[PDB]
Paper text:
One of these effectors is Plenty Of SH3s (POSH), a scaffold protein that mediates c-Jun N-terminal kinase (JNK) activation in apoptosis. The Rac1-binding region of POSH has been mapped to the disordered region between its second and third SH3 domains (residues 260–445). To delineate the interaction site of Rac1, we measured 15N R1ρ relaxation rates of POSH in the absence and presence of a 45% molar ratio of Rac1 and determined the chemical shift differences between the free and bound state of POSH using 15N chemical exchange saturation transfer (CEST) experiments. These data reveal that Rac1 engages an extensive 50-residue region of POSH (residues 322–372), encompassing two distinct molecular recognition elements (MRE1 and MRE2) separated by a flexible linker.
To elucidate the structural basis of the interaction, we determined the crystal structure of Rac1 in complex with POSH at 1.25 Å resolution using a fusion construct linking the C-terminus of Rac1 to the N-terminus of POSH. The structure reveals extensive folding-upon-binding, with POSH adopting a belt-like conformation that wraps around the GTPase, burying an area of 1830 Å2 of Rac1 which corresponds to 20% of its total surface area. Consistent with the NMR and ITC data, POSH binds to Rac1 using two molecular recognition elements spanning over 50 residues, both of which are well-defined in the electron density map. MRE1 adopts an extended conformation followed by a short β-strand and an α-helix, while MRE2 forms a β-hairpin structure, in agreement with our 13C′ CEST data. Compared to previously characterized GTPase-effector complexes, POSH exhibits an entirely different fold, with the α-helix within MRE1 and the β-hairpin within MRE2 representing structural features not observed in other bound effectors. Notably, MRE2 also partially overlaps with MRE1, forming a backbone-backbone hydrogen bond between S355 (MRE2) and S334 (MRE1), as well as a side-chain interaction between S355 and S333 via an intercalated water molecule. MRE2 adopts a β-hairpin conformation, with its interaction stabilized by hydrophobic contacts with Rac1, mediated by the side chains of V357, I359, L364, V366 of POSH.
Author numbering: 1 to 177, 319 to 345, 353 to 369
Amino acid sequence: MQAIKCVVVGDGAVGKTCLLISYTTNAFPGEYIPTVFDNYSANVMVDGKPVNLGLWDTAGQEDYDRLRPLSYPQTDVFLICFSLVSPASFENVRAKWYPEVRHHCPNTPIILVGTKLDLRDDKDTIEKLKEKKLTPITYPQGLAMAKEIGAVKYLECSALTQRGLKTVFDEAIRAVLQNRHSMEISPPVLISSSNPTAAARISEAPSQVHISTTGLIVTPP
Ligand SMILES: Nc1nc2c(ncn2[C@@H]2O[C@H](COP(=O)(O)OP(=O)(O)NP(=O)(O)O)[C@@H](O)[C@H]2O)c(=O)[nH]1
Ligand SMILES: [Mg+2]
């Protein structure tokens, strides 16, 4: 089975973990728990042929800067995420995440993902940004940032509503499997995860992330 490794990076609180849990299990977690590393191993069918996705979640906090690149070797595609309602997270795409990824991985494709699409029209969110002379990030603004960092695609989504969500992962797959026509991609079947919320939905005992000689590995429950 062809395997694809995808690593998700971006500022704290932009919605990386919810993106992964929502896509892989159609659930949306109930308490914000900061990530260290987590793995999701999910299968899809691309034009009727199985492909394994190895999805890696990372910590957005700067305290994990030294450790985070442990996840990077052998990555096939990065998702750099920012919240559509956090201008700071948007600027950090350029200031922090693009350089960090590119310095480690000069040739790996990047998809730029704007998250929390469901908040872009939220009155309270808009007003709070306006108090600070700011606005939610617009689609053209995200597109421009994607061009500045040489991302292969710019995509917007909500983990909460799932608008745009399948497309993020399908386009990540398409960006990797450049020889495939990839006309149709099935929803994912989660096989294993180290995230307790996601692992519980395979049932409905998480795997464990460990350091190994070869980088990060997963040990079964
Ligand atoms: N409305 C809305 N809230 C979202 C969405 N995605 C995430 N959130 C919320 O945003 C907060 C952070 O989400 P989370 O996925 O934990 O973010 P993270 O990027 O993994 N943070 P870290 O680097 O610290 O692990 C949570 O309160 C979560 O419910 C979304 O699509 N819409
Ligand atoms: Mg997280």
